[PDB]
Design a protein around this ligand. Structure first.
Ligand code: GTF
Ligand code: CA
Ligand code: K
Length: 430
DNA sequence: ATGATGACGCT
DNA sequence: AGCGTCAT
């Protein structure tokens, strides 16, 4: 009872750009705005692979991974924008630079953790304490929360979507104890006000819309963010967790979408995250290990402690290209030419990074895949990265992979290579 | 023949 | 270090 921690100590938000690469292309080309459209890479093989999809196009069934030729069968008027191609490969620079625009706006409000090109976690605990002191116990108006959903409401004793949203918000705000400065529900609500302001600033200063989740930890914030997209935000309170989790498939929780979650389902014979509450901590640790078991015991009760790490920049800078089916590299000269292409893009991104961010990479990771393996990587080897020079990096990568060549002939490469990857890691300040 | 990324855990 | 898992 009085000593049972409830995981209500932080206010954490997750901000996610809606269909991000599509928004970047629609900002640049107004002809694409408010249309079914997608971003594709390459074009020769079946129209290119779709990597991002506008919500108008999702209504027709267009998804990521689809070939554009097939997407066109579902949506004949689908508009397409192509990823830039440089040195024979996809170049994502435009989207990395757009992400920096958004991340720098977010950093004005709070320290952020860059989770991906288009996602950032925000720890709002301190910002919320300050805003509460500025209020001094004045109520929070619904006008301060114009795009916020309160998960689980309305409830209890209109048929339109915005009407539903406002009924739920009204019930939430009418129940709020605004005199208690340490009420977790109040803290979440103030967090949501700040996230409304953050999202307004992102849209004003970049043109990009996003969704967001606000809760007490990263897993609940990510789950919340997904509940109402696009261009909306959702508050998931601690009290909403039992009902929410009672029908939540286990695979929807971050880190449980793969083999571990499938094993939770198979071993325990359950389907929903709330069903985990019926096991002891020791039972869960016995099945899934000490760390995973403790994590599952707390997480199915809405409790998680993973911190929002203060990190706005990526930790690695990598360049990779697949060579599928018949295009697999079968000669020494082919392998050197593509290693050089990758190393030239890498050198350009590293030089830009060292000028912008005052750091240098010190380790070069080289990874390859051979025709036949089912694993995404067949071999990974590191060497020293001492100069930002593409010819040296490609020579060193070749040196650390050249003994993989099964061929007895010097000029041939067997088994042919279906993937090349160069990654700069282990940054030091400079 | 999805592809091109990127973070973190295990041993 | 090198390999694997999970995710955008
Ligand atoms: N497998 C993937 C997943 C994503 N992305 C790239 O990562 C970006 C963001 O990934 P997101 O958040 O998962 O999906 P969204 O497009 O933003 O759509 P939503 O509104 O539902 O958030 C994509 O634009 C991308 F461009 F598509 C990718 O390259 N490969
Ligand atoms: Ca997104
Ligand atoms: K995302």
């Amino acid at each position: 009872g009085p000593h049972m921690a409830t995981g209500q100590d932080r206010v954490v938000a997750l901000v996610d750009m809606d269909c991000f690469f599509v928004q970047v292309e629609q900002r640049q080309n107004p002809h694409l705005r408010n249309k079914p459209c997608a971003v594709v890479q390459y074009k020769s093989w079946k129209g290119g692979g779709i990597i991002a999809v506008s919500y108008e196009a999702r209504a027709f069934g267009v998804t990521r991974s689809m070939w554009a030729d097939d997407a066109k069968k579902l949506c004949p008027d689908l508009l397409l924008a192509q990823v830039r191609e440089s040195r024979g490969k996809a170049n994502l620079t435009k989207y990395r630079e757009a992400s920096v625009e958004v991340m720098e706006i977010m950093s004005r409000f709070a320290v952020i953790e860059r989770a991906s090109i288009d996602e950032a976690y925000v720890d709002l605990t301190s910002a919320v304490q300050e805003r509460l002191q500025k209020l001094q116990g004045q109520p929070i108006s619904a006008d301060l929360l114009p795009s916020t959903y309160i998960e689980g409401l309305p409830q209890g004793p209109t048929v339109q979507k915005e009407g539903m949203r406002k009924q739920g918000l009204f019930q939430w705000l009418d129940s709020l104890q605004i005199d208690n400065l340490t009420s977790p529900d109040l803290q979440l609500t103030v967090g949501a006000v700040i996230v409304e302001e953050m999202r307004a600033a992102i849209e004003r200063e970049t043109g990009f819309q996003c969704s967001a989740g606000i809760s007490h930890n990263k897993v609940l914030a990510k789950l919340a963010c997904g509940l109402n997209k696009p261009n909306r935000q959702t508050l998931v309170s601690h009290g909403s967790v039992p009902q929410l989790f009672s029908q939540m498939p286990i695979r929807k929780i971050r880190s449980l979408g793969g083999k571990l979650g499938a094993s939770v389902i198979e071993i325990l014979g359950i389907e929903y995250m709330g069903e985990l509450t019926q096991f002891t901590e020791s039972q869960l640790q016995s099945h899934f290990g000490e760390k995973n078991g403790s994590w599952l015991y707390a997480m199915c009760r809405g409790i998680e402690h993973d911190p929002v790490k203060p990190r706005q920049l990526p930790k690695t800078i990598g360049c990779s290209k697949n060579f599928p089916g018949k295009t697999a590299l079968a000669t020494r000269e082919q392998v050197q030419w593509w290693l050089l292409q990758l190393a030239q893009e890498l050198e350009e991104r590293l030089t830009k990074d060292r000028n912008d961010n005052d750091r240098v990479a010190t380790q070069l990771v080289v990874s390859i895949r051979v025709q036949g393996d089912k694993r995404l990587s067949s071999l990974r080897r590191c060497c020293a990265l001492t100069r930002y020079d593409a010819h040296k990096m490609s020579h060193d990568a070749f040196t650390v992979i050249k003994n993989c060549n099964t061929s007895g002939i010097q000029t041939e490469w067997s088994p042919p290579l279906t993937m090349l990857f160069l990654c700069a890691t282990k940054f030091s300040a400079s």
